[model samples]
Target: GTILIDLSPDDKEFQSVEEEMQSTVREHRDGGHAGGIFNRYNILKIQKVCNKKLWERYTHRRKEVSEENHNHANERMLFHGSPFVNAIIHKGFDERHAYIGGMFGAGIYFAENSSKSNQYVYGIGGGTGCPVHKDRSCYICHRQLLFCRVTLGKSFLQFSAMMAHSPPGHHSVTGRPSVNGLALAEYVIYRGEQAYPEYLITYQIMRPE
Candidate 1:
């Protein structure tokens, strides 16, 4: 069964997630140019995902990769910024619709730095409503990001571009900032089932005076 569980402001899970986002953003502040303009963020909403099918598929893939890699799957929770939250929750991450000409390749991209992920986050209008709901009653204008669990099993270190798939023995690609001219590290997976959208975070960027 699949369900979207909304977390209240005072919820324990909400607090923990908020802390994680804040700490990661702070730690990686110097990794990119967005650091100067990056001040802070206020989490407006959070939807905890319980997609059984996606979880099962992701876990199955993880298990296989784990065994092949000698019990080290290199699983990580990363951020993916996008506006199509509605479609992603219901259909899961699809590489077919991924942006073209990605520096590393045409694959689903995730970031270790929230600021890097925040670059892709865009505001939605009230008229559009929430993309995941049928009633479309929740009309709050905010930016969104998905905190996903990624299985980067036996990742291939990539410095150059034009790689559509992981090398023969690798399960994913890690784009290094220094060699690839990227501001932050990017983890890309060609397969859609390699990652699961664990949380949808709606937030507002706060600027310092």
Candidate 2:
């Protein structure tokens, strides 16, 4: 079943944008729920080592990807990466909705799970940060919104986003090659990495596996 995600301009509300948006979400619930994602989260739980790739092209970049975590059951990018370090983020999905697992954004007009357009949505209007737009991503998206929303409801001009990064090295005691000292990535080949932004954070945690 195809998800209809386009904004409607032919409707009467087209001139007001607001009306058009209202019409857009008329069946918003049905649109995002068609995938039966909410049930799948529990019916068949998942543990994935997702590989990141550009939206249109996943193979050309040859970017070595790793750093899988359990938070995706809740949201992607379990931990944000740093600019100094290299990591890849395709976009985002809301961390909050992971509780509803499969709940999505930007659906028609209600894209609360819409992770596909994070860059384009927020990148507009000198709004390099979040709340400026909502890709509804759990990765850089959600965190970006929390940081971008202005205090007293005014935008913070200097706000910049941060993330975490883990580099490939050897396990101290095990002497096994690793990334960010994570045991899971010890042996997998790592591709090129991007700089971890100044605000991005790097962390090590032991999650329930």
Candidate 3:
């Protein structure tokens, strides 16, 4: 139901990197989404599933209460449109050209109507939020990272570029805050983009019960 694409923004200090990705439609091939060329890709679609190992630790703390396993709950997520599309992943390793920019639109937002479309399309393996950058984080790093890599036809090689925007976002483990179960706690997606479940919601977790 979903795919995973790495999201780690570009920087000048990294040893590897991937060029900006371009999203194309199924039929039309003239144009599609361009690398960091657009800023609207900041919105995302979080897979409902939680990290399994992380969940197991939760279950261990509540050994007495009845608990449910949702390891597969968030197995898939589809982050459609802008705000969620851009993320920089990988550092100089493989690839001919790497992305060096981001999306462009209304203050890192979603398309106003469904009539919009991606300029190009790409696919990833099973899925993992290796770099789940948020658009509503603080004033510093809000843009979801974008990725690029070496490939022939459609084969992603390895990391290449300046830097990779690894996940847990906010730079490091110390970059986020939790409130009512959500990281950073409060983020406001434009009312128009609120329809996407992933970005509109927050996780309120407890030792599974």
For every model shown, what is its TM-score relative to the native structure?
0.79, 0.15, 0.17
lDDT of 3 by residue, 1-209 (tens): 22333333343212121111112212211122221123223223222222344334333422311222222211111223332332211111111121223221111122211112232112221112123432121222332322211111111121222122313212111112222122111111111211222222111111112
lDDT of 1: 0.73
**What is each predicted model's overall lDDT from 0 to 1?**
0.73, 0.20, 0.21
Per-residue lDDT over 1-209 for candidate 2, one digit per residue giving the tens place of the 0 to 100 score: 11112234353422333221122221122322221111111111111123333221322211222222221111111112112112223232222212121111111111212121121233322133334343222132222211010001111121112011113231101112223222110011111221111112111111113
What ranking of all candidate models by TM-score puts the best one first?
1, 3, 2
Q: Judged by TM-score, which candidate is best?
A: 1
**Order by lDDT, highest first:** 1, 3, 2
Root-mean-square deviation of Cα positions for candidate 3 versus the true structure, in angstroms = 20.8
Error of 2 at 131 (Å): 22
TM-score of 2: 0.15
> Cα RMSD to native, each candidate?
6.3, 20.1, 20.8
